[PDB]
Structure formats: structure tokens, C-alpha cells
Amino acid sequence: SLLSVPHTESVSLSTGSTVTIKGRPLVCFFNEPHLQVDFHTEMKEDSDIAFHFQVYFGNRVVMNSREFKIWKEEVESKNMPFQDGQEFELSILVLEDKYQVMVNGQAYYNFNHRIPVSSVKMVQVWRDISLTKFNVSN
Amino acid sequence: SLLSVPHTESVSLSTGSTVTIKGRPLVCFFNEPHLQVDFHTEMKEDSDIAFHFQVYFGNRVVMNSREFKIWKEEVESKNMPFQDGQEFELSILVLEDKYQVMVNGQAYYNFNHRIPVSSVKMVQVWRDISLTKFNVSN
């Protein structure tokens, strides 16, 4: 069963929360499908983003925050555990000091908190993926 | 009635052909939705691309070709006639010397042919849009 994409949900996070996302890129890596996960401070889609996670499948990952409507310092990663043509499971763990992004059960990306975790109220998952699971831990 | 996205169709083009695309970005420009239109040499999605047209809505446009599986010289445009939140009509006119991309009936982008027009056999339209029309002129 495919979930709506763009996928937008109300959330509440604290230390120990996990946001789990299972999906599949819509096309082969050769054509560079993208994935974007944005942790927003309000349900409104122009609200600030505590954690922006953008995957250029087969290429690289970009992370950032948008604070008072301004994009801040971009961080890059060349870690690329994602597998061409395959379903992936993202688990974004909310640690005290950072978000930690696991791909298939191992941590590959980290982003220290710039906006307090308690300010996050919405998550949006979008770009070139299908989605079968979006779960926030209880 | 919404068409499938990614949208992939067999085509045949010659001088005077028009490829018309009507669609709407899936989110507001503030969050930078994308649009990609690729004129391919075969139905296979890893085939070469005679004309790659990538819109960063609210930002800029990138055009290129992929020849023998290699991306060539990137050209940029800051022309941005697209309107936040609005349906657009793209008309890509196949001229003798170039592709000419009209937005709502006026030409804003041009790309001189690098691959012969007669080699184009497929068009793919994808990224963050909905689609209501894809028409190749008879």
C-alpha cells in the first residue's frame, strides 16, 4: 500500500524518538532521483526546518536548517549506502545532541541540533520516491 | 484528470514539432519544487538525452545533454517566468537549430542541438509536478 507523496504529518519528538521511513526511489540511480525529508516547526509548509535531509541517490547527501526563513550552513556527505533499485529503510533517531540517520540499521549521517527538538511539529517526505511506511515511535 | 508522473512516452520529432506539457508544481516555490524534462534517444531510461531541461522553481533552470552516458556542458538560465502556485504550459518547439522552450506562449530558453533531432525516441517528464497534458504535435 503506497502512502501519499509529498507526505506531510503532525509529529512530536523528544530524545529517544525514531522516525522510520520505508520507500523506494522512483527511477534508477543513473538518472539521479532525489529524496527530501524536512522536520518543520509548524504544519505550514513555509515554516522553519530544524532538519533538512536531501539525498541525491547515487551521488551525495546535503543537510541544513532553515531558520527564520533563511537557509543556514549546508553540510555535505558522500556516504551513499543506498542501493540502486532497492527499497530502503531510513531510521532517523533523535539523540540528545543530534539527529542520527540510519540506512538499513546503521548510522551514516549526523546533524547536530540547531533548532530545539521540542520545536519540531511536522515532517514532510517528498521528491522522487514511493512510500510504504512512515512511523513515529510512541 | 492527472497523468502518470514520472511520465514516459514514445515520440518522433522533426523540425516544426511541438511538445506541450501542462502541469502544476506539487508545493510552493519557497520549498523549491523541481521539474525535469528529458528527450531520450531510446525508450530505455538510461539511454542518452538529447535535451535535459531541469527547472528549480523560483530559482533557476539547467539544461544539458547526456551523450554516450556522459553529461556534457551544462548551461544555466536565471529566467524564471513560472508563477508560484500556478499551472504552467510548457511548449517545447523543435526548430532547425535548437529546442525553444516557451512558458505560457513566450520563449524563455533555447538549447542548440547537440544530438540530431531524428535520434529522439522518448520523452520523460518527472520530479515535483502533477501533469494534466502531454501532447506531441501531429
- Is the separation of the CB atoms in B6 and B130 below 8 Å? no
Contact B45 A26 (CB under 8 A): no
- C-alpha grid cell, residue A29: 540511480
Backbone angles phi, psi at B105, to 5 degrees: 95, 5
- The x, y and z cell numbers of residue B96, run together, are 532547425
**B127 neighbourhood in chain A, CB within 8 Å:** 34, 127-128
Q: Which residues of A touch B28 (CB under 8 A)?
A: 45-46
Q: What is the dihedral of CA B132, B18, B109, B37, to 10 degrees?
A: 50
How many angstroms separate the CA atoms of B10 and B19, rounded? 12
Distances (CA, A) of A37 to A7, A30, A41, B18: 9, 21, 13, 36
What method did the depositors use to determine the structure? X-ray
CB contact under 8 A, B34 and A31: no
Q: What is the DSSP letter of B4?
A: P
DSSP B31-46: G--EEEEEEESSSSTT
- The count of other CB atoms within 10 Å of the CB of residue A31 is 22
The conformational region for residue B59 under phi > 0 = left, psi -120 to 50 = alpha, else beta, is: alpha
Beta partners for residue B92, in sequence order: B19, B101
d(CA A79, CA A76): 9
DSSP code at position A96: S
Give the number of C-alpha atoms closer than 13 A to the C-alpha of residue A29, restricted to the C-beta side: 14
Distance from CA of A34 to the nearest CA of B (A): 8
The nearest CA of chain B is from the CA of A126 a distance in Å of 8
Does residue B7 contact residue B129 with C-beta atoms inside 8 Å? Answer: no
Give, in order, the Cα–Cα distances in Å from A97 to each of A39, A75, A112, A113: 16, 16, 6, 6
Q: Which residues of chain B have a CB within 8 Å of the CB of A127?
A: 34, 127-128
Can you list the domains of chain B with their CATH numbers?
A: 7-136 (2.60.120.200)
- CA B128 to CA B93: how far, in whole Å? 23
* Dihedral pair phi/psi, residue B7, rounded to 5°: -105, 120
Residue with cell 505560457: B104
Position A132: which residue type? Answer: T
Q: Euclidean distance between the first and final Cα of chain A, in Å?
A: 22
**Spatial contact of A32 and A129, defined as CB atoms under 8 Å apart:** no
Q: Name the residue among B89, B87, B109, B90 with its Cα closest to residue B99.
A: B109
> CB neighbours of A46 closer than 8 A, spacing ≥ 6?
A69, B28, B30, B31
Indicate left, alpha or beta for B60 from its phi (over 0: left) and psi (-120 to 50: alpha): beta
